[PDB]
Assembly symmetry: C3
């Protein structure tokens, strides 16, 4: 899994330990080994949500499998919870795009997962 969060929250408002928390919780929620989880946080962005520059987040989760209606609801509850608690972003100002990747379309270690 690869998770990116783009946010207008400033860098100093991203708490120490946040990438590690993301990694741990995504490993558990997806069932994937932590070694395969990548996370990326992009603060200080020029963004708006509903025309408003109040705190917001635009995110993507790519995974080989483990994507679907019920799973995605679970991930959203988890991730919006983290963004609210750690970054003080309202859940109704977060979008997360979920992408189920075919193994043949993910490169890693000089090859692909197919």
């Amino acid at each position: 899994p690869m998770f990116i969060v783009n946010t207008n929250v400033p860098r100093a408002s991203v708490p120490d330990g946040f990438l590690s928390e993301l990694t741990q919780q995504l490993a558990q929620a997806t069932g994937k080994p932590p070694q395969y989880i990548a996370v990326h946080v992009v603060p200080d962005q020029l963004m708006a949500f509903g025309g408003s520059s109040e705190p917001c987040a635009l995110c993507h989760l790519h995974s080989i499998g483990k994507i679907g209606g019920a799973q995605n609801r679970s991930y959203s509850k988890l991730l919006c919870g983290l963004l609210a608690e750690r970054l003080r972003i309202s859940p109704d100002r977060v979008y997360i795009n979920y992408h189920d990747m075919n193994a043949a379309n993910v490169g890693w270690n000089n090859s692909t997962f197919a």
Copy 2:
């Protein structure tokens, strides 16, 4: 809908009001309420288009529906027009990837849009 533009144009060359203009025009083009539109501009990037570093833009539009051949032509005319007029980027140095998302694959407010 959510729109990102990545560009090598400097931040100081992004005019005041640009995010609001994007929001408004995307609402109008997609037919979706502006409260549902998110926009993100990333200036000062290290980028090349066709081997050179004159102003350029690489963009993504994710939407739950409202994506298709004729619609996408209309979005491109709109968005390239805005990038040309406001950021002084030539339309032939803009790529826009259009992604039609399933509602179950978009997280928002602790759940999905399903």
Copy 3:
């Protein structure tokens, strides 16, 4: 084709000529003219791979065609090779997501590629 690499390697560690090298190598690999290749490098990112903040890269390649099982293995060897040689990133700390785009879903020059 368009290629983005997001990395925690610092900007000063990105060699002069890297964008040009990516452009030329992608043109050769995809068989597309360099005029159609766009490249984007984003250094200094807050990211982790497997919970670790050692050097890593998270990448995307979007192309209209030229994506598939064998082609993607070849691109992965090529691109991991470049990131190892030029940015000193281990191949086992690189993910590349390959996205085969329909021509009608790529905007350019006020229209689409359809």
